Write an enzyme that holds these catalytic residues in place. Structure first.
Site, mmCIF file in Angstrom:
data_model
loop_
_atom_site.group_PDB
_atom_site.id
_atom_site.type_symbol
_atom_site.label_atom_id
_atom_site.label_comp_id
_atom_site.label_asym_id
_atom_site.label_seq_id
_atom_site.Cartn_x
_atom_site.Cartn_y
_atom_site.Cartn_z
ATOM 1 N N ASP B 25 0.773 -1.232 0.000
ATOM 2 C CA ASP B 25 0.000 0.000 0.000
ATOM 3 C C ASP B 25 0.809 1.290 0.000
ATOM 4 O O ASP B 25 1.311 1.707 1.038
ATOM 5 C CB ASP B 25 -0.919 -0.031 1.221
ATOM 6 C CG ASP B 25 -1.953 1.069 1.205
ATOM 7 O OD1 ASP B 25 -1.881 1.951 0.324
ATOM 8 O OD2 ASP B 25 -2.833 1.037 2.081
ATOM 9 N N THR B 26 0.915 1.931 -1.162
ATOM 10 C CA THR B 26 1.663 3.175 -1.263
ATOM 11 C C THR B 26 0.973 4.304 -0.508
ATOM 12 O O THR B 26 1.595 5.322 -0.207
ATOM 13 C CB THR B 26 1.849 3.607 -2.730
ATOM 14 O OG1 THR B 26 0.570 3.727 -3.361
ATOM 15 C CG2 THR B 26 2.684 2.580 -3.479
ATOM 16 N N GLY B 27 -0.309 4.119 -0.202
ATOM 17 C CA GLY B 27 -1.059 5.133 0.522
ATOM 18 C C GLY B 27 -0.902 5.052 2.035
ATOM 19 O O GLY B 27 -1.383 5.919 2.762
HETATM 20 O O1 BE4 Z 1 -8.750 2.535 3.200
HETATM 21 C C1 BE4 Z 1 -8.093 1.952 2.302
HETATM 22 N N1 BE4 Z 1 -8.670 1.341 1.234
HETATM 23 C C2 BE4 Z 1 -10.104 1.303 1.028
HETATM 24 C C3 BE4 Z 1 -10.533 2.378 0.088
HETATM 25 C C4 BE4 Z 1 -9.966 3.727 -0.141
HETATM 26 C C5 BE4 Z 1 -10.602 4.616 -1.163
HETATM 27 C C6 BE4 Z 1 -11.772 4.127 -1.911
HETATM 28 C C7 BE4 Z 1 -12.337 2.785 -1.681
HETATM 29 C C8 BE4 Z 1 -11.700 1.922 -0.673
HETATM 30 C C9 BE4 Z 1 -12.051 0.546 -0.246
HETATM 31 C C10 BE4 Z 1 -10.686 0.050 0.319
HETATM 32 O O2 BE4 Z 1 -9.741 -0.354 -0.689
HETATM 33 C C11 BE4 Z 1 -6.607 1.907 2.419
HETATM 34 O O3 BE4 Z 1 -6.052 1.192 3.640
HETATM 35 C C12 BE4 Z 1 -5.791 -0.230 3.544
HETATM 36 C C13 BE4 Z 1 -7.025 -1.067 3.303
HETATM 37 C C14 BE4 Z 1 -7.067 -1.832 2.062
HETATM 38 C C15 BE4 Z 1 -8.187 -2.656 1.722
HETATM 39 C C16 BE4 Z 1 -9.355 -2.750 2.644
HETATM 40 F F1 BE4 Z 1 -10.488 -3.582 2.304
HETATM 41 C C17 BE4 Z 1 -9.344 -1.974 3.924
HETATM 42 C C18 BE4 Z 1 -8.160 -1.125 4.249
HETATM 43 F F2 BE4 Z 1 -8.121 -0.392 5.430
HETATM 44 C C19 BE4 Z 1 -6.262 3.373 2.372
HETATM 45 O O4 BE4 Z 1 -6.631 4.004 1.078
HETATM 46 C C20 BE4 Z 1 -4.806 3.546 2.540
HETATM 47 O O5 BE4 Z 1 -4.133 3.225 1.302
HETATM 48 C C21 BE4 Z 1 -4.516 5.011 3.055
HETATM 49 O O6 BE4 Z 1 -5.530 5.987 2.567
HETATM 50 C C22 BE4 Z 1 -5.083 7.328 2.189
HETATM 51 C C23 BE4 Z 1 -4.794 8.226 3.403
HETATM 52 C C24 BE4 Z 1 -3.436 8.796 3.503
HETATM 53 C C25 BE4 Z 1 -3.039 9.653 4.602
HETATM 54 C C26 BE4 Z 1 -3.994 9.985 5.671
HETATM 55 F F3 BE4 Z 1 -3.601 10.817 6.738
HETATM 56 C C27 BE4 Z 1 -5.368 9.431 5.609
HETATM 57 C C28 BE4 Z 1 -5.760 8.567 4.495
HETATM 58 F F4 BE4 Z 1 -7.079 8.038 4.444
HETATM 59 C C29 BE4 Z 1 -4.407 5.112 4.563
HETATM 60 O O7 BE4 Z 1 -5.398 4.868 5.285
HETATM 61 N N2 BE4 Z 1 -3.213 5.498 5.113
HETATM 62 C C30 BE4 Z 1 -2.976 5.647 6.532
HETATM 63 C C31 BE4 Z 1 -2.266 4.435 7.132
HETATM 64 C C32 BE4 Z 1 -2.443 3.001 6.854
HETATM 65 C C33 BE4 Z 1 -1.600 2.009 7.592
HETATM 66 C C34 BE4 Z 1 -0.621 2.497 8.570
HETATM 67 C C35 BE4 Z 1 -0.443 3.921 8.851
HETATM 68 C C36 BE4 Z 1 -1.288 4.876 8.109
HETATM 69 C C37 BE4 Z 1 -1.330 6.372 8.183
HETATM 70 C C38 BE4 Z 1 -1.967 6.785 6.848
HETATM 71 O O8 BE4 Z 1 -1.019 6.852 5.751
#
Ligand code: BE4
Lengths: 99, 99
Positions: B25-27
């Site tokens: 996860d690059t995000g």
């Molecule tokens: O919710 C998700 N997918 C869902 C999604 C997103 C958009 C549209 C649809 C869907 C459905 C899923 O794919 C993803 O999480 C994994 C994940 C994957 C599949 C699933 F099933 C559930 C699930 F949690 C999520 O997009 C992450 O890529 C990321 O989001 C962007 C972001 C960045 C900075 C911030 F400050 C706040 C933010 F939000 C994020 O939450 N980052 C935070 C993080 C994560 C782990 C550790 C530390 C930190 C801090 C911060 O970077």
């Protein structure tokens, strides 16, 4: 281009004639942007991630330009803390993870 | 290897002698895994995602193999929906986004 991950992979996108900053997010299935006005009809949707779910508005067939690359796809609009470019659009610009 | 994004970028990781599936996860700034037992003391941390924040346990200098690549870094453990390999470890394996 090749983007390293030392910092968040933020890029400029163009949508609805507006320039915005967004995160290239491989962990996001879809694309979600902060509250904004888009044309056409929308459908409500619930998306979940870390922390839980949020309610967003789903717009289809939306044109977006990512780093000069045009892509068409579904765009969700809602209370997301950051603009997210998810896999549904990353694939369209030919983005891949390499190591 | 080169991973496309038509499907979730899931890979096999090895930690604590066990194989688990995780998302590249690059995000995600950090790496967070589903509840499990890790050695040593932990420190508290709050991480915010799309739906809000969750409390996790932070373990440092943890050995984790990702797709055969050995990494040693900080691993968070908590109520995450899926195992996430974030930028802190993606950089260790030399992962980049390309298009
Ligand atoms: O919710 C998700 N997918 C869902 C999604 C997103 C958009 C549209 C649809 C869907 C459905 C899923 O794919 C993803 O999480 C994994 C994940 C994957 C599949 C699933 F099933 C559930 C699930 F949690 C999520 O997009 C992450 O890529 C990321 O989001 C962007 C972001 C960045 C900075 C911030 F400050 C706040 C933010 F939000 C994020 O939450 N980052 C935070 C993080 C994560 C782990 C550790 C530390 C930190 C801090 C911060 O970077």
């Amino acid at each position: 281009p090749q983007i390293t991950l030392w910092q968040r992979p933020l890029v400029t996108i163009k949508i609805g004639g507006q320039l915005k900053e967004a995160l290239l997010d491989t962990g996001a299935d879809d694309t979600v942007l902060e509250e904004m006005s888009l044309p056409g009809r929308w459908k409500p949707k619930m998306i979940g991630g870390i922390g839980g779910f949020i309610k967003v508005r789903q717009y289809d067939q939306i044109l977006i330009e990512i780093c000069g690359h045009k892509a068409i796809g579904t765009v969700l609009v809602g209370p997301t803390p950051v603009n997210i470019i998810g896999r549904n659009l990353l694939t369209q610009i030919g983005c891949t993870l390499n190591f």
